[PDB]
Structure formats: C-alpha cells, structure tokens
C-alpha cells in the first residue's frame, strides 16, 4: 500500500572463525566496517519513490556456515534485494560466501597489511566464479591503517554503483509492465515479449484491450472530483500554440475542451490501472480499485483508438512528468506506441536515477553539409561534428525542458524529492499545447511542445531484442545542443514544429560507431530511443551485467566499466568479455 | 540453352496505409522511388553471363499485408532472388517486410524531414532483427528535399554493392559444380565436401570419374568439325616456349602434335559437360549432349591422369580465359587439382566482377634480406617489404597478363563484353606455350607461361572448410609488381620458369597477419588462392555476410566493411560480430 | 623404477612418392633434415628430470598411407609423444599427415624455390584444419639454398618451443595429483576437480586422509637412518630467526626439536607418498613402498593438522627446493593449502622449465603514494608504478633467494643440473627459519624467511575453473624489485616479518588490466600466484594452446604469440581466436 515492501540492502560482516585471541580482536573492527557501510548507503542512497534505503546487517559476524545460515535465515524474512559482505581480515571462503544465486552480490575487503581483507577478497571471488554464482568486488587503491573507520572516495563510488543498480534490479523483481493495447503499426518493441519480461527482469506483462480505457471514461469509472480538480489545473496553467490544421479540421471550442477534457480522464485511468485507486471502491468498482501492480506501462494508441478517440499525448507527457493537478510525485513510466522496449528502457533509467524520462523518435541526423546548406549557418561547439534531432510524436516529460537548476544554477533534470513546486511551474511556463494534426490522429489531441536547453549532459540508451541472441542494450552519451534561433526555425518547420525537441550530440570516440555523429545514427537499433539526464552510462552498464544483457554498443570510458569480477576470466576485450559471459550465464531467472 | 532464367530483383515501394489525403499525396513520390531505383540498377548492373539484369516492381504501393502478400505472389513467378524496398515515409514495419528467409534484403529509406523514409528503415530493420530474417540498411549522409528525385553518390554505392553480392547469391542457387576426377594428392579442397555446397551455397555436386573424359576423347564424343577449328587456331596463333627434358624426354617422334590435339580435345570435352552442347545429339550422343548444369568444375588431374595421359594445363588455361577459337566469351570456371575451395573463391570473383580469375599456388616469400642475398638489388618501391610469388603449376586464365588496357590506358582484367578481339589477341602473343615436365607429367602437356604487369591492383582471396567451425573466408589486396629483368630471371629459373608468375604484395596494416609480408603468407590457410582484378575486398566481404561465411582474415577499411544491420547488435568489432552473427543464423539453406 | 619410460619426440621425413628420378633425388636430403632436426633436440633439450631427450625417426621416408601406418607402428611401441614432420619439397598432404589426435604435432616446411617444401607445409595444415586435428607450423622466414643444411635461428626457436611445451603435455599424461588432505579454509582451488585433471591433462587424483601422514610417522613407516642424516645436515646449516610469539607461546628447547624433528619427517613421508621408497619394502612395509606415482601434491594443512600438529612450512621449503641433505636434486611441486590449482601452473613451469617454482600469496598492491605515505620515500626505476607484495604463508622454494648465479654473474634461478653444491649452500645460508606464529599454527613449525633479490624477470602464472568456461590461465610477466633497506623494513614489519619476500613489478603495456599495477592486481583471479624464473610467457601461451586452456589475461608481445595454425582460422584477433578456438576443440583427452 505504497512502500509495498521495498528491498532492503543485507550486509554480512564476515571473520576468521579461530580464537585463542584472534577472531575476538578482530570482532569490534568487522562489525564497525558493517555498520560505517550501512550507514553510508542510508544515507547516500533513495528508492526512485523517495523512500529511504534500509539495510540489515547479520545478528553476528560470519565465520562459517551456521553463523552464514544464521544470517540467511534473517535476510529471507525481512526481503533483502542485494547483499555485501565486508571483512578486513582472512576468513573461509566458500563456508562464507553468499550462496543466492540471483540476487546481486558485492564483496568489500579492506586494504590493509595487519588486515589482509583483499587476500580474502581475491579467494572468495575465486569461490563464486567456480561455482558459478559471479559478484562484484570492491577494492580500494591505497593501503589503509588498521585504526582507519573511513571509507575512501574510490570505494564509496563503487558501493554506491553497486547498490544503485543492484536496488533497481530487484525493484523490479515481482511487478508488472502493463501492455494498453497490442502491436502499434507493426513497430517491433510493441510486440510484447512476454518470456523476455519474466526471465530476465523477472517481472509480469498484463495484457489489456484499449475498449477498457473506452469503457472506464463511458462509465464513469474514475474519480469525478479528481477530474474537475485537473480541469481547473489546466485552464489556470495551460499555455496553447497555434493550430496547425487544415482549416476543415480546426475544432471550435465546446470540441476542444471536449478533447482536453478525455485526454485529462486518460491520464487518470491508466495512472489508476498501474497503480490502483481505492476511491474506486466508493462508486461500486471495487474489482477496479485494484490496480494491476504495474511499475511500468505502454498505450498502443495508433492506428485503433487514435483513428477515433482523442491521442495518448496529454496524458503520456504528464504521467511521465513529476508533477500534475496534485503536485509534485514520482513520474510514472508509460512508454507511447506501446513499445515496450522503450519502456524498459525508461524503467532502468528511472530506477538508477529517480528522474523523469524522455520517450524520443530519433529522426533525423543532420550532417554539417546538410545545415550549411539548408539554412547557411557553418556550425560549431558540440554541434561541429553533426547533430540528431530527436522528437517523440507528440508527448515527453515536461520535465524535458530543462528548467529546473541544480545548486549551481544550471539547466537540469532532477529527482521529484528535489523538485520545488515553483520549477514544476516553471517547466508547464515552457510547455505550450497543440491540436494535434487530424490527419495522423483523427480523434484530437494535445501535444506537448518544449525546446530542450543546450549545454545537458544526456544519456541516450535502447534495448533491442535479437532473435538467436537475446536482448541487447545500446548506450551514447552526449549533450543537448543550442542552436541559434535562426537555424532552429529552418530545421523544426521544415519537420515537425508541433513536437518537443531536444538537439543531440554525442561524444565522439574516434572508434567503431562513435568515428562520426552519422555512424552513431545508422548503428541505433530501432527508431526510438531514451533520454536520462547526465552521463549515467556506467551506471547502465553495471545494471546489464547484472542481468546478463550484452551492450552491443557504448561510448562509456574502459575504466568505468564495472561488472562481476567473472567477466574478467571470460577475457581482457571490454566486449568480448561481455558477450562470453552473458551467453555463460544466462538470463537472471530462468532459461 | 544458355539464358535458362536468370535472377530478377525484386522492388516494393512501401507506404503509409492510412487516406484522408495522405497515402494519396506520397503514392507518386513512392513509386517513383522504386522506378529509379529499377533504372539505377538495370542501367550499372550486368549478369557475370553479360545479360542485362532486369527488375520487377510491385503493382502498387505496400502498406499492409493484402498488398504485401499480392506482391509476394507476383514475385514468387518471376524469379526475384533479392529485394529492396524503398520508401520517402513511415509505414508499418512488421507488416510490410519481406518476411522471405533466404533471398538478400535491403531497405532503403529516403533521407528527409517531411519525408521520415529513415524513421522507417530503423523500425523495419529492428522486425527484421527480433524475427532472425537480417536485411541491410541503405541510409544517405545528407538530408534531401522532398522534390529532390536524385540518387545520392553514397546511396548509389550501397545499393550497387548490395545488388552485386545478391546476384551472385542468387545465381549459385540451384546449379552444379562438376568435380571431374576426386581428391588429387591428398589436398583437402580436393576432398569435395557436398554438404558445403548444397547448405551454403545452395548447390549441388556431381561427381564423374576421370575414365569418362577418356570415353569422350576415344569414342568421339564431340564435335569434330569443332576440333578442326581449335587446331587451326592454335597453329596460327601458339607461340611456343622452349622445351627443357634434358634434350631427352622430347617429342621428336612428333607425340608433340598428339598431345596439342588432345589437350584441345580435353577443353571442348570438359566445357561440354558443364554446359552440354546440342552437336552431340547429331552424332547419337542424347544423353551427352544435355550436360550436368554446371558453373564451376574441378579437374583432378594428378596423380592417375597425368601418369599416362596430357595434362590439364591446356584446357584448363583456355578454359578460364575470356577467349578461345571461337572469340570472346564469358570464362568459365576451373579448378586445377580438383580444388573445389579455389572453385568456389573463383566462382565469387566471377559473379562479382564478371572477370576472368587467376588460380594460383602461393609457392614462396620473398623477403628482402633473401633477394638481397640472391640477387644483390636491395628492393624498393611496392615490393619495399618483401614479395610473394603466385605461380600455378602450369595454367592461368590468359587475360592474367594484363594486356588488356582500360579507358586511361592502363593494364586491367575486364569483363567478356568489354574485351575487344585486339585485346583478345595480344593476351594470347603474350604467352608461351612449353612442354611438361615429363618426370611430374609423364602423359605431356602444354604450360601457359606469361608475366603479369607491374602495379595492377589484386585482391587475393580462398575458402578453407575448418571442422568444428565451418566454412571461411581470406581476403588480401594488395598489387602485383615489376621485378627489374636481371632479378627477375634469377628468382624465375630457380623457382619454375615455364609456369605464369604473377609478384605479389599485399597492403601492410601494421596489425594482425597484416603486420609484414611474411605474416600474410604465414597465416594463408591453403597452398593456393585466387587472384581477382581490383580491390574488391569489400565486395567479398558483403557477399560472405549474406552466406554467413565468417571473414579470418583481411585488409580492408573497417569504414568499407557493409552488412545486414543485424551484424551490428553481435558487437562494434568487425571481426567478433562476425563469428557471433555467423554462428547464430548458420547456413542459409539447411542445418 | 625411475626413468619410467620418460616421453620420446617422433620425427616423419615426408617425401613425393613418385619415382623415376623424382623421389630418389631427394630421399638423402629429406633424411638429413630428420637427423639434423634430431641432433638439434637432443643436444638442446632436457626431460625436467635431467635426462636427455630421445628422438625416434621412421625407418623410411613416408609418401603415401603403407609408409605412414609403417611409421605409426614404430612409434606407438616407442612411447612418442609428439611428432615432428620434416620435408623439403611437395608431399601428397592427407595421405602423409599424422592423425593422431591427441598428441602434439608440428610441421616443418623447409623454405626453399627447388625445394617448395612450404606448399607442402600450407596443404598439410589445410587437411589437420579440416579433419579437426590442429598441426604446429615451423616455416622460416628468409629463402635457402637446396644444399644449405643449417636451421635458421627463428626455425630453431619454434622447434624448441614447440617441443619444449610438448615434452610437458606428454610428461603429464598418465601421473597422478596427490591431494593429501582436503578442502583447505574453503579455498577454491582446494576442492580438487577430478575431471579437470583427467580430461584436460590427462592425470589421475590421488585423495589421501591427513591421518595417513600421522600413522607413518607415528608407526616408524619412513627410513630412521635417513631421518638421523637430515637432523644433522639441519644443526650443521639452518640459521634460526628471532621469536615472534607471545613469551607464554614461546616454546623452548626440547619442544623445539621435536617441531624441526616432525617437520624434517613430514618431507620425507610426503615426498614417499609421491614416488614411493625401496627402503620401505626392507622394513616390511610393501603396499606404502610403491608411492601413487604422483608428479605433483597439495599439503591441506590448515586448519585441522596445523590446529595440533607442526605445520607444512618446512616440507614445503624443503620439497619444493632443488636440494636437501641428500644434495641437489630435481625439486619436487607441492602446493601449500592444497591448491591444486596452484600446483597445476607449478606443474606447468617446472615442466617447462626443471626449475623450482615459487608458491606466492598476492598480498598486498602498494601505490606509489602509499609508499609515499607510510615511508616518505618517492619512487622510481621498476618499482615506479606500483608494486606486489608476494610473500607465501610459510613456506617458498629456497632457490626463490635468487642466490644462484648465471654466467655473466647475475642472480638467478637454474635447472637442478646446472646448481652446485656451493650454491644449494649459499641459498640455505640467505634463509632464516623462524617459528611458526602459535595463534594460527597451534602445533607450531619453521618458517623459511628470505628475501628476493631484485632485478630478476618472473613470470606470474594461475589457473583458475569457471563454471560455464572451464579452466583458463593468467600471466603477468614483470621483475622482482630490490627496495632500499629503509622502505622494505617499514613494510615487511607492518605485513609478516617471518615469511618469505618478493616484491614484483608487472611489465605495463597501457591496455586492458595493463593499464596500470592496481589493475594487473585487480584483476587476478585468486590469492594465490606461482613464480617462474624469467619471461616464459610465451612458453606459457603454447601449452596453453596444446591443452585447450584459454589465456584470458597476459602481457607477452602478440608477435610470441606461437599456437596451431587452425587458431588463425577462428579470427585474427590474438584473444578471440583463442576462445573460439578453445571451445571448437574442447579438452584433450575427453568430452
Ligand atoms: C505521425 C506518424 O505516424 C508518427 O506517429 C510516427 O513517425 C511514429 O513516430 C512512429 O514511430
Ligand atoms: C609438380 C608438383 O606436383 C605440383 O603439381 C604441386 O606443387 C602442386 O602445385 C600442388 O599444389
Ligand atoms: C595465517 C593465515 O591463515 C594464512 O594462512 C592465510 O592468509 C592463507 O595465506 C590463505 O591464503
Ligand atoms: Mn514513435
Ligand atoms: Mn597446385
Ligand atoms: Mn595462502
């Protein structure tokens, strides 16, 4: 009921089992080491839902496998998601090690000489590779002393990356990817693959006809309160462009309001099928109170219910946004044509950062040749090498315009516990609302029209699915750009002046698909892709080798890469590794 | 006879299905599309035969599946081997791609802002990728106007090279490869492997025992008015070498005149039952006169053959020469040694270039160190880093002299239709024909002995079966060079100077095999290889992707490298993507 | 009983068979290229265990399949373990290779133009790639004239090496691994794999109960006059170190002798248990005179022997030495802790090599700026990057000093044959016993303490098993470094004083886990490495490739990188070939 019971982090202090003195002097530093790692995590880490993180630590330090069942026995009821073990000593490794062989595993071994944690480290390690269950190390670069309790900078930043992504793995575990409609124009990602969501997220696909949103706006089934309450919010806040319609189709008033009045009762049904909604119970819809446990959703909308019925637009921009008519909140994931692979996509990006998600068509590159000739500008900056415009079809998280600033006044994207009422404001200030174009969505609709600032650091990712090979994950990090408005007049009439922009360019490597912005283009994998505020690509990568997802392609720094130490036994080559290792291993559960 | 239906290319301009204006407005610019990509094709493109290539385009535009599968039935009838869809907008991917499993596809989506062809072609590609049916992607680098009907250079190229290895796919389909004798001294290519054949390349393997030949010869199972005429020929043309037995195993007795007859007869015989010849149903001959269908043979040769008999050398130089006494015509394709994998290399040179190919026993590395020794002249130039001599044990296509010249005047291998009676004559001034070597060739015979031309640009190529892996496939391009005369002769006499040389240098990379001249030879997985005009490595290289042979071994620009997109999901390496995509989708036609 | 029928090398003359001049010109020439290649072995190399090697030649030169079976059959009642086919002109390939599939082969083409001895060499690898058998290629790199008879230095490097590491394949074949004990502290590696041992070495495991060392020594089942001898040679040369147990520990006198006592019989014993002992079977103990044949040993020791009864330091030393009060003799390779896997790459350098081998914990990465920190002292030379602190539990080879020396007087570690009695005793004088620290070792022991000398080159090997993989092997070769006396006091007093120190600097190449010496440390796939004298890394890769063990970390030059031929045909890159290669092929002996 909110906090549905969230994971918790299990840390397992272990120890050389021996007396006569020994593992009694080293009892205090151990348990010291769990607790300074605890305390750490709880405070430097949130759920994406704003939640603290609680950890829970072994009743006693762990020498051998009575003591470790011991634990095991605590960890089981109280739902740890991910364990770390820490020790600054030699102990027994495989009486010790964590035997669970999925969830995520870190081992931390203090550096130091009296305290020889890292011979440990290296030998448990051994262990788990052996017996096939990998995990995470954790070893820092300089030699600490014995009465040392702090935690140095590199080891923070991998415990840190360790449980971040280890957190979003097993938030997932157990929820539902809720499909609202089927296949949208014969686009690949909206062909749900229901054994990809169980196997290797581990979550459930529930399958819904889009008669069911018809039927709950014909019968009432929502809350009639609520929507006068969001009618009010949009009158008050809602700036409208410019009709861009064939003067046939411009719809007078009563139809607009009409449209804006479905597309807002939209935005609640869907929120209410993910979520569940227990004022639902009052008006006799006690079976649709429910909800259907949905941490991520897809609405078909074209060609079916669009051909008709007003466009998913209004209510995809808001729900993917931090805030609506009720404040500022978690953003929902509901990825648009129902393309699900998108939506995973988005639902990584969202668990290992608690932002709201861009959903962007990647449509066109625009060569340097090709700027300069259509609008005379020779450009320059991070746009000097090309440029990919990217623009969903109509909706994207208001939060996308980038209004919202950091601590040192920058244009950013920001965590909804971090957000003030007054930027929420500010980023619907940015948003101007249009017709949608009748001849593409004959029912109406509203979109979300935003210019994304220049100067953000952007992730850009997509999962695709392979037959013969699985899923695969495709990252670029890059920049958004600004482009002198002259320019950007030329370029966005000439496409499709109605839809939210963000300009992209992404770092170049010099290699492979990143020797040029075009080959960066021609190597995406589908035509949509996911924009996650800052260069998160680590963190993307830390989180697929978790679940065994190769990344066929990157532009993330060889020393950033983090994976269970095993990768490394499959090879020195960054991909090779990958590719061996996710074939070894397989998906997470099952198959 | 002759013309038996060759392979058509199949076009299907795809559309946005939905009206209202719309699909009205794009339906003129689509089938436009597909009408200059028909003219495009037909107008650069030639069967390696000399026949135009024609085209078949859809009877109207696809947007769904009723059209799709119209199409299809269209298509099915008129024998299309590859097709290419093309298309300026958004259609509904899944259900508008050529779901065929085995023919080569492409998609080609028209660069522009009001026209999203692109938007299309990510999509498309991605349902091609999740289904396991790869296609390749034709994107343009620059973005184009609506009103622009132009092919872009970049464009062009792709679809050129894209068209070129389908033909060549589509053309091995269904016919034969005649291995006339069996494993000659125990070289494994000689080891015909008819599983190869009929899962890779879609063919089938007839084999005939030598003593057939034998039977043609002594029963005159051939066109004797025909031999008259080779006879004629050959006297009035053959410029003899000088014999070299020791003035011992001679031909005073005038067997000389007996070996020349039977060594013309062995070409008309063999060229008879690859193709059949209608004179033979003349002389009772029916069942002979139809011929085993076949575009590539092998003729074993030594030892059984050669020990009693004239050798090959003859037949199997006019053979694979682009002209013989009844002027120029396409070159046929024969092994020597019944080396089934250098038949197979030959044969893709052939469809890919419609060219005459050099078959070669890559006999010894030359470094610089060893010719300084030998000879005293420190080399310089192309063969600067060390040489490799390509000499087959008696015959070579005639046109490997390089006589031939092209527009700019230079030494060149052209296609049959381009090669001009002149030329025709002054490839055959250029060679000397000398007697076997008795105690090798105790049967007699007559070598082919000529020098090719300095500075021609190669690309040296061979198949070799690996069990536990399979078929692949090694590329080297490179140049052949000019020896100064007094060099020359030294290296010439000390090797075989009655056989047809052809030095040799590969393009140095500075990694891999590539590092030095001796490393290419060292890593040569056979004794012989293929030798094709130009550097077509490329083409080779998007031809073996299309009957996923892995690539081992090659030189060429990794920018140069064109695959199905699906290549690019394995891995940003050139080379592991390879073996990953390979290994996945396996043998085009079975297992 | 001794000299038990050590492995012989096999040398196959190939020749063309036909007469009539052809083969009887070249039969002298062909054999003599066998007897040089002979003579050349036989004077270069030697057994591990110092005997000379023997070559086996076949009784004619071979030419078809009647010779080649001929040949066999000498052979296999010969006990040759590898083959070595020599030839200098062409050769009829699959009817004269060796199908062996199991033992180790390599083919030498001798490179000349009269003699094309290399296009016998290309064929002859085609056919072992093709029928899945994978051949050595020995072909040199400059021309020679027919009737030059030297081997030229880069030909005899590869006939060394490949014999060098073939020798070690068939060395192993058919001796047993003696686990004396068990598990060891839940070490990985101590859990022996029967199956590795047998499938891809082709040993058997010996288990073997800790109580059985206890009952040999408590019921006399050794030779007492041996024991009287070592006690004597102990008082006569071990210098004791200074006690660092807690006085109410400290035991004195009386106690102390019988410590040195039990350890000086534990050697003894263990060392029977491996090769059994004569003298036995006079006292009436005939089942425990004949030993378990084994070549190699683990000792469990800890934590049950080590709780009650002195521990494994001083058999350790001793055995793994290349001298004892017996003299200098071929060390003996038993793995501290029982791990085997240790003992593996042990058994592979002293085959190799017939060098001791130094058993080492990977305890400590030392940066330069906690150098700096804890001593004050800037780096450079060597050590300038970072180093490793190897210092085993315990116990270490005494040859590990680096006391001997090499003609040009620098320090070093030698074959057994090449130590003199002045330097065994210069070794025993630079190491210090000390007793074993109470708390971890209750039933005390000596320790042999002593210090490495710097500027010597290692190599650093293990062996790990990864579930899913198989086994595979690391390599970092680097130096061992001498610190100023300052610096090495404050770091070995903060560490373990009493134990054996080497302190290594790893060769950085600025790739992969080269990058820098944190990662070469972070990288390693256990606590434990083994040191071998020099760069052998190259040796270590071939071995490698004869036993299908992947290499999936090292830092030799990809120009030493020698394996079969059939490895190029998995790719060009040095580490995916390997993977590819490894998992085509699979284990030597079976599945
Ligand atoms: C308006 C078009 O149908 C639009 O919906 C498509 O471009 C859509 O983005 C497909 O991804
Ligand atoms: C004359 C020799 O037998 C010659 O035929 C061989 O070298 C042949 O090239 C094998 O490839
Ligand atoms: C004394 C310790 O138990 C010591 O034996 C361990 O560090 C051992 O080296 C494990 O590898
Ligand atoms: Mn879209
Ligand atoms: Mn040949
Ligand atoms: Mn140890």
Same mark, same amino acid.
């Given at each position: 009921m909110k906090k549905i019971s969230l994971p918790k982090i299990g840390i397992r202090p272990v /120890?050389? %089992?021996?007396? *006569?003195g020994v593992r009694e002097s080293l009892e205090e530093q151990t348990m010291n080491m769990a607790k300074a790692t605890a305390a750490l995590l709880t405070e430097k880490l949130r759920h994406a839902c704003g939640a603290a993180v609680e950890c829970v630590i072994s009743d006693t330090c762990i020498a051998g496998m009575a003591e470790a069942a011991a634990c095991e026995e605590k960890f089981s009821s109280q739902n740890v998601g991910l364990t770390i073990t820490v020790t600054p000593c030699w102990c027994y490794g495989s009486e010790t /090690?964590?035997?669970?062989?999925?969830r995520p595993k870190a081992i931390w071994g203090f550096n130091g000489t009296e305290r020889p944690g890292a011979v440990y480290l290296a030998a448990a390690l051994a262990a788990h590779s052996q017996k096939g269950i990998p995990a995470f190390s954790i070893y820092g670069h300089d030699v600490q002393d014995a009465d040392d309790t702090s935690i140095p900078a590199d080891v923070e930043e991998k415990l840190l990356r360790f449980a971040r992504a280890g957190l979003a793995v097993a938030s997932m575990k157990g929820k539902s990817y809720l499909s $609202?409609? %089927? !296949?949208? *124009?014969?686009?690949?990602? +909206? /062909? !749900?693959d229901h054994n990809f969501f169980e196997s290797w997220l581990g979550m459930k696909v529930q399958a819904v006809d889009m008669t069911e949103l018809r039927r709950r706006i014909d019968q009432k089934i929502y809350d009639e309160a609520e929507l006068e309450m969001a009618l009010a919010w949009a009158d008050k806040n809602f700036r409208y462009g410019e009709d861009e319609n064939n003067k046939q189709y411009q719809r007078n008033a009563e139809q607009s309001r009409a449209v804006l009045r479905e597309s807002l009762l939209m935005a609640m049904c869907i929120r209410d099928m993910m979520q569940?909604? +227990?004022? $639902?119970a009052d008006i006799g819809r006690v079976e649709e109170? $429910? %909800?259907?446990?949905? /941490?991520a959703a897809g609405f078909q909308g074209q060609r079916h219910w669009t051909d008709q019925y007003p466009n998913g637009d209004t209510a995809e921009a808001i729900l993917n946004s931090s805030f609506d008519w009720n404040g500022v909140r978690e953003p929902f994931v509901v990825a648009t044509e129902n393309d699900s692979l998108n939506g995973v996509a988005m639902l990584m990006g969202h668990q290992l950062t608690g932002t709201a998600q861009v959903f962007a068509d990647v449509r066109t590159y625009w060569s340097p040749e090709a700027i300069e000739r259509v609008t005379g500008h020779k450009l320059d900056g991070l746009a000097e090498h090309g440029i990919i415009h990217l623009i969903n079809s109509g909706s994207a998280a $208001?939060? %996308? +315009?980038?209004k919202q600033r950091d601590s040192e006044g920058n244009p950013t994207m920001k965590p909804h516990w971090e957000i003030s009422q007054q930027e929420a404001d500010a980023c619907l200030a940015a948003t101007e609302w249009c017709p949608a174009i009748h001849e593409y969505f004959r029912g109406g609709g509203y979109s979300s029209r935003f210019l994304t600032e220049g100067g953000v650091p952007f992730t850009m990712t997509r999962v695709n699915i392979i037959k013969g090979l699985g899923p695969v994950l495709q990252i670029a990090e890059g920049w958004s750009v600004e482009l002198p408005k002259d320019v950007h007049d030329i370029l966005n009439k000439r496409t499709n002046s109605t839809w939210p922009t963000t300009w992209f360019a992404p770092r170049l490597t010099g290699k492979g698909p990143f020797t040029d912005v075009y080959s960066v283009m021609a190597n995406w994998g589908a035509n949509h892709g996911v924009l996650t505020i800052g260069h998160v690509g680590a963190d993307f990568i830390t989180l697929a080798s978790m679940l065994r997802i190769p990344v066929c392609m990157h532009n993330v720094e060889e020393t950033k890469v983090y994976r269970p130490s095993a990768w490394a036994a499959h090879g020195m080559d960054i991909e090779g590794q990958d590719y061996r290792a996710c074939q070894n291993y397989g998906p997470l559960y099952k198959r």
């Open positions: /120890i050389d %089992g021996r007396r *006569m /090690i964590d035997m669970d062989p999925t $609202l409609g %089927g !296949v949208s *124009m014969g686009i690949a990602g +909206s /062909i !749900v569940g909604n +227990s004022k $639902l109170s $429910l %909800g259907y446990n949905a /941490i $208001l939060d %996308g +315009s980038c």
